[PDB]
Coordinates of all heavy atoms in Angstrom, one line a residue:
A15 N 17.7 14.5 -64.5 CA 17.1 13.4 -63.7 C 17.9 13.1 -62.5 O 19.2 13.1 -62.6 CB 16.9 12.2 -64.5
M16 N 17.3 12.9 -61.3 CA 17.9 12.5 -60.1 C 17.8 11.0 -59.9 O 17.1 10.3 -60.6 CB 17.2 13.1 -58.9 CG 17.1 14.7 -58.9 SD 16.2 15.3 -57.4 CE 17.4 14.9 -56.1
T17 N 18.6 10.4 -58.9 CA 18.4 9.1 -58.4 C 17.1 9.0 -57.6 O 16.6 10.0 -57.1 CB 19.5 8.6 -57.6 OG1 19.8 9.5 -56.5 CG2 20.8 8.5 -58.5
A18 N 16.6 7.8 -57.4 CA 15.3 7.6 -56.8 C 15.3 8.1 -55.4 O 16.3 8.2 -54.7 CB 14.9 6.1 -56.7
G19 N 14.1 8.6 -54.9 CA 13.9 9.0 -53.5 C 13.1 10.3 -53.5 O 13.4 11.2 -54.3
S20 N 12.1 10.4 -52.6 CA 11.4 11.7 -52.5 C 12.3 12.8 -52.2 O 13.1 12.8 -51.3 CB 10.4 11.6 -51.4 OG 9.8 12.9 -51.1
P21 N 12.3 13.9 -53.0 CA 13.2 15.0 -52.8 C 12.8 15.9 -51.6 O 13.6 16.7 -51.1 CB 13.2 15.8 -54.1 CG 12.3 15.1 -55.0 CD 11.4 14.2 -54.2
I22 N 11.6 15.8 -51.1 CA 11.1 16.7 -50.1 C 11.7 16.3 -48.8 O 11.6 15.2 -48.3 CB 9.5 16.7 -50.1 CG1 9.0 17.1 -51.4 CG2 9.0 17.5 -48.9 CD1 7.4 16.9 -51.5
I23 N 12.3 17.3 -48.1 CA 13.0 17.1 -46.8 C 12.0 17.3 -45.7 O 11.3 18.3 -45.7 CB 14.2 18.0 -46.7 CG1 15.2 17.7 -47.9 CG2 14.9 17.9 -45.4 CD1 16.3 18.7 -48.0
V24 N 11.9 16.4 -44.8 CA 10.9 16.4 -43.7 C 11.6 16.2 -42.4 O 12.7 15.7 -42.3 CB 9.8 15.4 -43.9 CG1 9.1 15.6 -45.3 CG2 10.3 14.0 -43.8
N25 N 10.9 16.6 -41.3 CA 11.3 16.3 -40.0 C 10.2 15.7 -39.2 O 9.1 15.4 -39.7 CB 12.0 17.5 -39.3 CG 11.0 18.6 -39.0 OD1 9.8 18.4 -38.9 ND2 11.6 19.8 -38.8
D26 N 10.4 15.6 -37.8 CA 9.5 14.8 -37.0 C 8.2 15.5 -36.7 O 7.3 14.8 -36.2 CB 10.2 14.5 -35.7 CG 11.0 13.2 -35.8 OD1 10.7 12.4 -36.7 OD2 11.9 13.0 -34.9
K27 N 8.0 16.8 -36.9 CA 6.7 17.4 -36.6 C 5.8 17.3 -37.8 O 4.7 17.8 -37.7 CB 6.9 18.9 -36.3 CG 7.6 19.7 -37.2 CD 8.4 20.8 -36.5 CE 9.0 21.8 -37.3 NZ 9.7 22.8 -36.4
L28 N 6.1 16.5 -38.9 CA 5.3 16.4 -40.0 C 4.1 15.5 -39.6 O 4.2 14.3 -39.2 CB 6.0 15.7 -41.2 CG 5.3 15.6 -42.5 CD1 4.9 17.0 -43.0 CD2 6.1 14.8 -43.5
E29 N 2.9 16.0 -39.8 CA 1.6 15.3 -39.7 C 0.8 15.5 -41.0 O 0.9 16.6 -41.6 CB 0.8 15.7 -38.5 CG 1.4 15.4 -37.1 CD 0.5 15.8 -36.0 OE1 -0.5 16.6 -36.3 OE2 0.7 15.4 -34.8
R30 N -0.1 14.6 -41.3 CA -1.0 14.8 -42.4 C -1.9 16.0 -42.1 O -2.2 16.4 -40.9 CB -1.8 13.6 -42.7 CG -1.0 12.5 -43.5 CD -1.7 11.2 -43.6 NE -3.0 11.3 -44.2 CZ -4.0 10.4 -44.2 NH1 -3.7 9.3 -43.5 NH2 -5.1 10.6 -44.8
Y31 N -2.3 16.8 -43.1 CA -2.8 18.1 -43.0 C -4.3 18.0 -43.3 O -4.8 17.4 -44.3 CB -2.1 19.0 -44.0 CG -2.6 20.4 -44.4 CD1 -2.0 21.5 -43.8 CD2 -3.7 20.6 -45.2 CE1 -2.5 22.8 -44.1 CE2 -4.1 21.9 -45.6 CZ -3.5 23.0 -45.0 OH -3.9 24.2 -45.3
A32 N -5.2 18.7 -42.5 CA -6.6 18.6 -42.7 C -7.0 19.7 -43.7 O -6.6 20.9 -43.6 CB -7.4 18.9 -41.4
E33 N -7.7 19.2 -44.8 CA -8.0 20.1 -45.9 C -8.7 21.4 -45.5 O -8.5 22.4 -46.2 CB -8.8 19.3 -47.0 CG -9.0 20.1 -48.3 CD -9.7 19.2 -49.3 OE1 -10.4 18.2 -48.9 OE2 -9.6 19.5 -50.5
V34 N -9.5 21.3 -44.5 CA -10.2 22.5 -44.0 C -9.3 23.6 -43.7 O -9.7 24.8 -43.6 CB -11.1 22.1 -42.8 CG1 -10.3 21.9 -41.5 CG2 -12.2 23.2 -42.6
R35 N -8.0 23.3 -43.5 CA -7.0 24.4 -43.1 C -6.7 25.3 -44.3 O -6.0 26.3 -44.0 CB -5.8 23.7 -42.5 CG -6.0 23.1 -41.1 CD -4.9 22.3 -40.6 NE -3.6 23.0 -40.7 CZ -2.4 22.4 -40.5 NH1 -2.4 21.1 -40.2 NH2 -1.3 23.1 -40.6
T36 N -7.0 24.9 -45.5 CA -6.6 25.8 -46.7 C -7.3 27.1 -46.5 O -8.4 27.3 -46.0 CB -6.9 25.2 -48.0 OG1 -8.4 25.1 -48.2 CG2 -6.4 23.8 -48.1
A37 N -6.7 28.2 -47.1 CA -7.3 29.5 -46.9 C -8.7 29.6 -47.5 O -9.5 30.4 -47.1 CB -6.4 30.6 -47.6
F38 N -8.9 28.8 -48.6 CA -10.3 28.8 -49.2 C -11.4 28.4 -48.2 O -12.5 28.8 -48.4 CB -10.3 27.8 -50.4 CG -9.5 28.3 -51.6 CD1 -8.8 27.4 -52.3 CD2 -9.5 29.6 -52.0 CE1 -8.0 27.8 -53.4 CE2 -8.8 30.0 -53.1 CZ -8.1 29.1 -53.8
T39 N -11.1 27.5 -47.3 CA -12.1 26.8 -46.5 C -12.0 27.2 -45.0 O -13.1 27.1 -44.3 CB -11.9 25.3 -46.6 OG1 -10.6 24.9 -46.3 CG2 -12.2 24.9 -48.0
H40 N -10.9 27.6 -44.5 CA -10.8 27.8 -43.0 C -11.6 29.0 -42.6 O -11.6 30.1 -43.3 CB -9.3 27.9 -42.6 CG -9.1 27.6 -41.2 ND1 -8.9 28.6 -40.2 CD2 -9.1 26.4 -40.5 CE1 -8.8 28.0 -39.0 NE2 -8.9 26.7 -39.2
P41 N -12.3 28.9 -41.5 CA -13.1 30.1 -41.0 C -12.3 31.4 -40.8 O -12.8 32.5 -40.9 CB -13.7 29.6 -39.7 CG -13.7 28.1 -39.8 CD -12.5 27.7 -40.6
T42 N -11.0 31.3 -40.5 CA -10.2 32.5 -40.3 C -9.9 33.3 -41.5 O -9.7 34.5 -41.5 CB -8.8 32.1 -39.6 OG1 -8.1 31.2 -40.5 CG2 -9.0 31.4 -38.3
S43 N -10.0 32.6 -42.7 CA -9.6 33.2 -44.0 C -10.8 33.3 -44.9 O -10.7 34.0 -45.9 CB -8.5 32.4 -44.6 OG -8.8 31.1 -44.6
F44 N -11.8 32.5 -44.7 CA -12.9 32.3 -45.6 C -13.6 33.6 -45.9 O -14.1 33.9 -47.0 CB -13.9 31.2 -45.1 CG -15.1 31.0 -45.9 CD1 -15.1 30.2 -47.1 CD2 -16.4 31.4 -45.4 CE1 -16.3 30.0 -47.8 CE2 -17.5 31.2 -46.1 CZ -17.5 30.5 -47.3
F45 N -13.8 34.4 -44.9 CA -14.5 35.7 -45.0 C -13.6 36.8 -45.3 O -12.6 37.0 -44.7 CB -15.2 36.0 -43.7 CG -16.2 34.9 -43.3 CD1 -15.9 34.1 -42.2 CD2 -17.4 34.9 -43.9 CE1 -16.8 33.1 -41.8 CE2 -18.4 33.9 -43.5 CZ -18.1 33.0 -42.5
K46 N -14.0 37.7 -46.3 CA -13.3 38.8 -46.8 C -14.2 40.0 -47.0 O -15.3 39.7 -47.5 CB -12.4 38.5 -48.0 CG -11.4 37.5 -47.9 CD -10.2 37.9 -47.0 CE -9.2 36.8 -46.8 NZ -8.4 37.2 -45.6
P47 N -13.8 41.2 -46.8 CA -14.7 42.3 -47.1 C -14.7 42.5 -48.6 O -13.8 42.3 -49.3 CB -14.0 43.5 -46.4 CG -12.5 43.1 -46.5 CD -12.5 41.6 -46.3
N48 N -15.9 43.0 -49.1 CA -16.0 43.5 -50.5 C -15.5 44.9 -50.5 O -15.0 45.5 -49.5 CB -17.4 43.2 -51.0 CG -18.4 44.1 -50.4 OD1 -18.1 45.1 -49.7 ND2 -19.7 43.8 -50.7
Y49 N -15.7 45.6 -51.7 CA -15.2 47.0 -51.8 C -16.0 48.0 -51.1 O -15.6 49.1 -50.8 CB -15.1 47.3 -53.3 CG -16.4 47.4 -54.0 CD1 -17.1 48.6 -54.1 CD2 -17.0 46.3 -54.7 CE1 -18.3 48.7 -54.7 CE2 -18.2 46.4 -55.3 CZ -18.9 47.6 -55.4 OH -20.1 47.7 -56.0
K50 N -17.3 47.6 -50.6 CA -18.1 48.4 -49.8 C -17.9 48.2 -48.3 O -18.6 48.7 -47.5 CB -19.6 48.2 -50.1 CG -20.0 48.7 -51.5 CD -21.4 48.2 -51.8 CE -21.8 48.6 -53.3 NZ -23.0 47.7 -53.7
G51 N -16.9 47.3 -47.9 CA -16.7 46.9 -46.6 C -17.5 45.8 -46.0 O -17.4 45.5 -44.8
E52 N -18.4 45.2 -46.8 CA -19.2 44.1 -46.3 C -18.5 42.8 -46.2 O -17.8 42.4 -47.2 CB -20.5 44.0 -47.2 CG -21.1 45.3 -47.6 CD -22.3 45.0 -48.5 OE1 -22.1 44.9 -49.7 OE2 -23.4 44.9 -48.0
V53 N -18.6 42.1 -45.1 CA -17.8 40.9 -44.9 C -18.6 39.7 -45.4 O -19.8 39.4 -44.9 CB -17.4 40.7 -43.4 CG1 -16.7 39.3 -43.2 CG2 -16.5 41.8 -43.0
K54 N -18.1 38.9 -46.4 CA -18.8 37.9 -47.1 C -17.9 36.7 -47.3 O -16.6 36.9 -47.2 CB -19.3 38.4 -48.5 CG -20.3 39.6 -48.4 CD -20.8 39.9 -49.8 CE -21.9 40.9 -49.9 NZ -22.3 41.1 -51.3
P55 N -18.4 35.5 -47.7 CA -17.5 34.5 -48.3 C -16.7 35.2 -49.4 O -17.2 36.0 -50.2 CB -18.5 33.5 -48.9 CG -19.7 33.6 -47.9 CD -19.8 35.1 -47.6
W56 N -15.4 34.8 -49.4 CA -14.4 35.5 -50.3 C -14.9 35.6 -51.7 O -14.7 36.6 -52.4 CB -13.0 34.8 -50.2 CG -13.0 33.5 -50.7 CD1 -13.2 32.3 -50.1 CD2 -12.7 33.1 -52.1 NE1 -13.0 31.2 -51.0 CE2 -12.7 31.7 -52.2 CE3 -12.4 33.9 -53.2 CZ2 -12.5 31.1 -53.4 CZ3 -12.1 33.2 -54.4 CH2 -12.2 31.8 -54.5
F57 N -15.5 34.5 -52.2 CA -15.8 34.4 -53.7 C -17.0 35.3 -54.0 O -17.1 35.8 -55.1 CB -16.0 33.0 -54.1 CG -17.1 32.3 -53.4 CD1 -18.4 32.3 -53.7 CD2 -16.7 31.5 -52.2 CE1 -19.3 31.6 -53.0 CE2 -17.6 30.8 -51.5 CZ -19.0 30.9 -51.9
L58 N -17.9 35.5 -53.0 CA -19.0 36.5 -53.2 C -18.4 37.9 -53.2 O -18.9 38.7 -54.0 CB -20.0 36.3 -52.1 CG -20.7 34.9 -52.1 CD1 -21.8 34.9 -51.0 CD2 -21.4 34.6 -53.4

């Protein structure tokens, strides 16, 4: 056990993060080819 205090070290460029940025949801990552080369939502 540690003494109290958030252990995560941060600096001044920290901003809250928009959930749409996760790879699951962001348009840059959401689409993936299937094994036939067709580009679909990743889970399809």
Side-chain angles (χ1 to χ4, degrees):
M16 305 178 67
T17 56
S20 169
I22 299 170
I23 299 170
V24 303
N25 67 22
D26 272 339
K27 57 214 188 178
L28 186 64
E29 293 181 348
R30 284 170 57 198
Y31 169 104
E33 187 176 20
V34 74
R35 291 170 50 190
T36 69
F38 289 139
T39 54
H40 200 258
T42 59
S43 50
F44 175 77
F45 298 106
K46 297 288 175 201
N48 70 9
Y49 66 90
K50 293 164 185 167
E52 318 178 272
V53 175
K54 302 185 172 181
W56 69 268
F57 56 90
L58 298 180

